[PDB]
Structures are given as structure tokens and as C-alpha cells.
């Protein structure tokens, strides 16, 4: 699967 | 045969006086049985990861170094999503957990997320991960 979180910056 | 939870249990047990390889490669062996082994154990280790008792978290790095070694490509592709990375993150960044983590903690994440970045140059979200974490200042 492919989703995910965002990156957390 | 026994849980993720069962093993990583007994392999992180801030009671343990040595490391624990029954229970060490028994979490990456038992991770790599089940269909949703990888997703789970991801979960499991993030949390022990972010332990307030060092040697809890200490001993699930040494896990999660294990596995990433033993395991994968299901394996290396949980650890190589954000929904884990951002977890990590949390632990060596001063916005976040930093603070309260030792500098051991965070020079052993810091140390795997080099590692991942030249051994695993497939998972582009720990490249990013990194030198996010590089750009920022936190490495060098």
C-alpha cells in the first residue's frame, strides 16, 4: 500500500 | 509460537542485564511469519523507541537495527514510511521529544538513519528523512 503521512517537518 | 508482543516484550525488558537474542532475532523471525507482521511490529517498536526508560528504548533500537538487517523488503518498506520515520523524528528533534531523550538515544537513530541511507538507497523516504534532519542542523 501506498499512503502514507505527510513528512513531519 | 509466541506474539510480536509477547517477543518484543521480553527483548526490550528494561530488566534484562544483557541483550536478549532469542527474543531479538524471535521478533524479527516472527515479524517475517505473518501477513501483517511488518505493519504491527513498526507500531510495537516506535513506541518502545520512545520510552522514557532508556534501556527499554535502547534495546528496541537494537531490534529495529536487527531486523532491518535480517528482514525485508516488507519490512525495510514499513520502517521506509513516514507514518514510522515521523516517529523517529519525534525522538531526535528538539521540537518534539528531544529534549527529554538522551544523547545516546538520538546518536543511535541518527546513526541507523546513515546506515539505511547508504544500505538501503531503495527507501527514498529515509534519504529524505535524513537529510530533512541534516538540513535542519540536527546532523551533523
Redesign the interface.
Known sequence: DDS?????? | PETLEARINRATNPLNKELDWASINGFCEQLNEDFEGPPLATRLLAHKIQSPQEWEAIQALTVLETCMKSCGKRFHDEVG???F??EL??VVSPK?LGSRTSEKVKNKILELLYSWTVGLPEEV?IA??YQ?LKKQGIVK
Not at chain 1, 4 to 9: A, G, M, V, Y
Open positions: 502514507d503521512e505527510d513528512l513531519l517537518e | 514510511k513516514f507514518r520515520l515521523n523524528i519525534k518534539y523516504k529524505e528523512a530533512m
